[PDB]
Each structure stands twice: as structure tokens, then as C-alpha cells.
Design a protein around this nucleic acid. Sequence first.
RNA 1: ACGCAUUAAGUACCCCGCCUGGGGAGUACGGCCGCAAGGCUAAAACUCAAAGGAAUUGACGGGGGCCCGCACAAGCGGCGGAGC
RNA 2: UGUAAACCUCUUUCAGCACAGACGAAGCGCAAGUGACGGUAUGUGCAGAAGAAGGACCGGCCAACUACGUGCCAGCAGCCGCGGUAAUACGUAGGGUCCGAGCGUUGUCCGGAAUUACUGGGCGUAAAGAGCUCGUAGGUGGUUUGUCGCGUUGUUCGUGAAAACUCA
RNA 3: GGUGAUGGCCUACCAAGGCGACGACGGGUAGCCGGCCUGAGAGGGUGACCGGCCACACUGGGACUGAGAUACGGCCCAGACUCC
Lengths: 131, 180, 200, 122
Amino acid sequence: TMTDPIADFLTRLRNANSAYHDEVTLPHSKLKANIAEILKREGYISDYRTEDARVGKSLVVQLKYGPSRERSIAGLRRVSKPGLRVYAKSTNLPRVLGGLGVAIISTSSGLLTDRQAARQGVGGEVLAYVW
Amino acid sequence: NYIERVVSINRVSKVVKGGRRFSFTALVIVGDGKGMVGVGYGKAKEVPAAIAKGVEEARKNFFRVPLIGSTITHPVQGEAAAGVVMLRPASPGTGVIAGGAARAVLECAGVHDILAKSLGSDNAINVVHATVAALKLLQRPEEVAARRGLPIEDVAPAGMLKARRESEALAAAAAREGSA
Amino acid sequence: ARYTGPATRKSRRLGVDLVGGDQSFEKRPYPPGQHGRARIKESEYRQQLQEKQKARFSYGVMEKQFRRYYEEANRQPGKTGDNLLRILESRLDNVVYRAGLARTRRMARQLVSHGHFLVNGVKVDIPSYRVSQYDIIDVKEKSLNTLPFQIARETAGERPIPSWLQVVGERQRILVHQLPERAQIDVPLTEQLIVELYSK
Amino acid sequence: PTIQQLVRKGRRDKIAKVKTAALKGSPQRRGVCTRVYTTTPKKPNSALRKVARVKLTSQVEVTAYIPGEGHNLQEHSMVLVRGGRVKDLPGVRYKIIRGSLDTQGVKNRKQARSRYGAKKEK
RNA sequence: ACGCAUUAAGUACCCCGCCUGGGGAGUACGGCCGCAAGGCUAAAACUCAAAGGAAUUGACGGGGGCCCGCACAAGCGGCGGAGC
RNA sequence: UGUAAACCUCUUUCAGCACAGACGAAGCGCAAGUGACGGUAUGUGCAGAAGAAGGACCGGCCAACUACGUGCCAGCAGCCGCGGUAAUACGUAGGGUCCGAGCGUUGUCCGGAAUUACUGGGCGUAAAGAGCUCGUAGGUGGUUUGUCGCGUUGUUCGUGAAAACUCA
RNA sequence: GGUGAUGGCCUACCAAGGCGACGACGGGUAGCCGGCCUGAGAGGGUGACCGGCCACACUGGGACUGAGAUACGGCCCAGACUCC
């Protein structure tokens, strides 16, 4: 069954980005909305919007494509999955592509980029890698 | 000044009614050492002729590597045919640390300090193709920043920024020494 | 233990003149032996090996000593090749040869070994002593008047001394500022191959 | 395998094949021969290889090759066996040290002398 | 590699079974089940420097298709028997 | 071979022979002395190149090749494999390479081995999906509100003996 | 009851419980660690010197003295061995 909604988010995003679609429709959750907020802030997605469906809200994200047809997302991989969960200290924050990517970490202060978490000194569970 | 290396000379055979017809193959890598590399694979009836075909093919197929002064930008993992090669940036003064084919491609491209390891299919040609794929997977910070629409300050870390500064300073100092 | 065999032989094999001013290298630039004329297949191990051979056979160090020096330099924060060359140039024999009192490195080795020198007032007769910052090197009285030392010191118009070494008095006094950097070592050959060989 | 399957079963290493069993954790053993004889090698090769069937201090009977061109060893003499592989002889796993106990260093040997236990000339 | 390709062998998450060179061997001993035939669990000594998968170029087929040649078929004259 | 040598000059470390000769003891002691190491370390003199190099390897991995001697013999070998009268692979020579008071062999462990794959592997045909289901323990879990602070994270205190490791 | 001390530690009675696939009970092997070797790291191997604990003193039992006892150069008994 559906066991990992966040991995479902990531694989839907990855498949649509590989197929060059422009919009992506998901069932909606607050965690997914926050992840989309981080992705929008870091420039990976153009914009996201929540819309009401028959059984609830729905997340729609617009993908960002380069003027030469280049994709704004190179990879999308989850890290802390059910079963093996990954927690990171403030002094062991993961780096993606030598820091050229972004790692989204759930902390007591909320969802933060690894740069933000290293700056604030907090740590937590690493959710996914984006590059 | 084109630097050429020849990693594999392999004697290859086809059998006909009379017997075996023998021909030679050469895998040649051509690079200038300034960040421009290209791999060529040529085959002929003799070693010198196969070498000429390989060199011409490599010169025809060139390709640019995103270096940062001496080392590559970020770690990467290339995969071609059944060969797997991992590349990891190294600190200044380390030197090229890689196998035969990987070292040849890597030093023709102009990389000086880099960690490299081959994780399958020890065949030279497939390791070369895996290295080429890994190099193709590299990205420049300016292009990443343009791709995600952010200034370079929020994309690359401070260490890469200082390395960029020092590489630019060395380039300018050498240009000044050459011009005057 | 030192190496006593012929010196121009190793320059012949290694393709680089080491002492510098001999005629044998020029009249016989090819490697020794019956088959020194044979064409030789190229190999990266051959290159990296011969590089070390030039370094060690120019300075006089043995393999165990040189490997220990390499490990020390790799441990040092600087670039491994630079730390190598500056460590091997901190040796007393090399410093003496560089200051001009020795017409060659073998001269410096023997002249330090027989205790003709003294650093900061202590009789130091070991060639592998590593000169530090701010060291004053003087000679002893018995060696000051001896004929070969006198000849070399009085006729010393050969190769110029570098910056960090400085001879200052007619008594042949040596004084050092700093450990050299890669511009100031200015010995031949290359360091990257040296590093890669031991990285193998 | 899944992470739960790993926390359930785990990864087991490949079992190590004990090589040169007769030595019993010893570098060399002092044996004694039962026979001295020649043995024909495999198909591709052809020779007459000299061996000895040594009864060992480890209470094991082994066959050991005898290097060199000439050996003084006759039947049941004291020797010093050593580990070593020879393809030509399928069942031979040990070598006899030349120059120890009754074994004489081979004669007229001049090059790679230390392997064959021959003293330096004069 | 052949090929798979919304019925994936594609991108992903959860749980289970299994593999770690070829023989020896799914065999021996021990145990459980079975009326029996036997099944299930399952080694070691010894030995080899390979055993394999896919695809290529030839060769071959008491495989197919299309063609020829005193090859057969239709004829003439022989050799194999005798002396030299 | 080889600037190697022979020869001309030179310095003589270390050994040799002589003379001097400790620190270790702000110590012990109410006695005048108290150092086993030790007459050693260490100093100052004399003699003269004088008393001092060997071991593996040289088909490929793997730095380093030619001649003569046996021709499937004798032997070599870490793996492929070298020997069947013109062997760079055997033996001996020259020559060379690598180390050097060491140089090789054996034994054992780690590495290379992503070859038990947590980092970091797989199962159509190469080894590998139970013949197929049901279900116990276990593992795993859709959207959302509140609470706990067990997991998680931050900070502080105690502890983590010394030696070890790394930086000065 | 005992001990310095709690406690099936021992004893009398009463209840029938306690441990086990998160491997009881068995079998094999082994002193444990700070550390050492290797490795990029995780990991693998190991417990030489030096240092901290533990166990033992020909084998197997036992207690005494004592603040404190595996009491190596103590005692008692039974054994094997050496000697008068």
C-alpha cells in the first residue's frame, strides 16, 4: 500500500520532470506543502498552489524549465525512509554535490535547509536530497 | 600542444575459410591539459594506422571538463556499459590517484589532484567510458545558480568561493608574467 | 650507510646531470651497460621510480630515510611535494653544499661527518641533522686552517648561494633565515611524480 | 535484502580454507622421510621430479619436493620441510629446505645462492 | 546482450524467500515424516583454473531455398581376367 | 665494465693506542664519608686510506638483457606457463635494477576483495523468486486536532585513570 | 538460622510456580580491557611489551589466625610422583 507519502511526492516529481510535464497534481498534506515551500524557495520549482478536490485539498506544483529546455532539477532522492530512519547532528550535516545541492532536514524549528540548520546550530532528521 | 595517451592496444581476430584475419585496435585519449578532453577508438590492420585513426577520432570528439583551478567541482559517479567509476575532488598537492585508463583520461583532461576508483568491469574501454560519463555529469556553479535562479552566494559554499578566487588570481598572475 | 659507487653512472642512467660540471655525462649521455643503447618501452612506474632515483641519488639519502621524510611531509599541512623538498633541503649536508664551502654534496657529507662543523656551539658530526630557523653554523679552528678547506673557501667563486643561506665573514660563517619555498629550492625534476609513487 | 532481514539474519563471512595444514601454525617443521622417489608431472609438462614422503613432527605424512639439481637424501633421513606450491605435482604442498639438518646445499650453485643454502665461494 | 517497455525487467516505499566459483552433492551421517517408493533439513575431506550467460565470424548438418560441373541419367569404348 | 681503476693531492667520522674523566646525589649520614653502572659515556692527543659489503631480482604484473652450456633431459614457477640443438623464463657468465648491515624464503592477519555489499551487490536467460494460498509472532503504515517529551535535537555539569594516537 | 551486609545464602511450613525462538538447557572455543596491526572510512583481525582488573599456585577438598586470605616460598586430609 501507500507507506511513504513523501517518497511518493518525490517519485511523482521525478517522473514528471523526466517526462517534461509542466504541472503535477498530488493529494495534499501539510508536510508536502512545507517541502514544496522549501523547493520553491531554493529555486527548484517555479511555484506551487493548493486546490480543493472532492475528498480534500490537492497540491499542484509548476515545474521550472530552462530556456534551452534544461531541467531545473538534476536529481531527487529520499534518505530517511520507514524502517531505516536517518538522524543527523549539527556537526554532521550532510552535503550534496559538495554543497551545490540542498538537503532538507526536519528540525524542532521546522523544515530547514542544511545551510539554515548549520547556521542556527540545530539538527534533526534528514528527509531528502535535491540537486 | 595536444597531449596524447594510448591505454589499450588489443590484437583482434576474425576467422574465414582460409584461417584467421588479424587486425589491431587502439583506444586513444587526446587532451590539451587545460580542461579539454576527448576519447577516440580506432581500428586498423597495423598499430600505427590504428593509432592514427584513434587520434583523429579523439580530436573529432572533444569535450570540456568543469575544473576549479586544479580539481573538479563536486564528487560524482559515472556509469557506462558495465563499468562504474567514482570521482571525488581532492585538495591541492594531492596528485592524480586513479587506475590506468582513468589516470590517462584524467591527466589528459588537465586534472592534477583528484581521487578516482573503478567499481566494476575492469575492461579499459568501459572504464574510460564510465570516466567520460562521470565527467559529463559535472556541473559548474555559475550554471547551477542560473538553473535555479539564485546568486552564486547562496549556491556554492565559501570554500569553493575562496578556491575560485585563488584560481583566478593565479591565472591573472601568469597572464601578467606572460604578457610583459 | 653511504653509497660509494661511481656518481656519473647514476646521472647517466637517470638522464639528468647531478653533480653538474663533469665531462663524462656529456661524452656519454646514454644509460650504462651493454644494452644501454636499447630502445625502452614507456611506463608510468618507470617515470615515477626514476624521479625518486634522481631525488635520492642527488641528495644522498637512503630509501628508509626518504620514505620517513615523505611520511613526515605528507603529515605536514602544506603540499606534499613542497614539504618534501623543503625537508630534504633542511639537511646540514645540503645547507653546507648550498653555502659554497663544499664543491659537491659528497664533499658536504664527508666534511660534516668528520665533524668539521659546529651549529650553535655544539660539535655536530651527523649529515642528516635538519637545520632549523635562526641557526648559526661555524667551523672549528683545526679545520679552519686545513689545506683543502682553505683552498675551497679562498677560491669560492662558483655557483651563487640562495636567499635564505648567507655567508657573511671570511671565517666562512653560515646563517639561515627561513626554510625554503618551492621557488627557492630550485633543484631539478618534479615533485608530483614523487608523491604519486609513494601514494601507489 | 531489506534492513529488517539483515537485523534478523545478518551477513555471514565466507569460510576461510585452511592452507598448509600439516605445519600446524609453524613456519617450518622438522620431519623425516619415508621414501625418496621421482614423480611424473602433468600432461603439458614432462620431467622426472624428485620428492620425499616425510613423516612430520605434527604426526602427519606429507610429500615434499626437493629443490635443486642434486640431493644427498636417502631413505629416512632428517630434514626440514617448508610450505610451497608446485603445479606439476598435483598432491605436493610442501618443499624441503636446502642447507638445513641432513640436507646439503646444492653443488656448483653460484646465483641466487641463499635460496639453495650454498655457502659463498672463496 | 537478447530484450522488457502502463500486464515493466522503468522511477520509488514496505514485508518475505533466496545467491556468494565448478565438481564432490541435493550426496554421506543425524533427525522428522511415509505402508513402501522415497521426501524435507543438509555437510566435510579431496580435486580443478575454470564452470558459465549473450552475441559475432567461419566451419559443419543423414536443415531449408535457388543454381551449376561427363556428377548422375541416355549412349560409345575400356580397366579389373591373359602375355609382355 | 669506466672517472670506474691505476697514480697525485686531501680529511680522517668510527674502530686502535695514550692522558683526563661525569650528571644521575637542593639526596643519605652525625659522621668524614657515601655511584653498582664505570674508569664506562664523554673529552684532548698520535698513526695512516689505512681495519671495514653484501642479498635478491632482471617474459608480463614489475625498475632492470646479451653470450655460452644442456634440447620435453637437467631444472624453473606467485598465476598465465617456460624447457622437443639456434631459451631474454633452466645453469654459468658478463652487464643491469632494487635495497643496503642487511637481503630473500616460510608461517599468520588486514588490504586489494563492491568477493557477506550498513557506507557498498544481486535473483527472465550467468548462482539465486518457496508449486500456490491462508494465517501466528514480527516488521511496516492513509488525512487531521490536542497532549506527553520516550526516540530525535540543542546547551550545561560529572565521568570517560595513566600510558597510547594527533597538534604545538 | 546465618553474615559485615541484602538475599533459597540455609532451614521448617505454604502456594505451583520461574526461564525459553528478543534462542532456555546443551556442545565447542576463549581470560577481559586500555590498546596493537590493517583500512579512505565503516569494518576485519588481535590481546606480544607497558598499564588496570580477574583466576590459579602438583591434583582435588577444607578451615584457622587475622583489619584484610586463590593464604605461590602457611596449616589439615586424600591422591600421583621424587627422596630418606
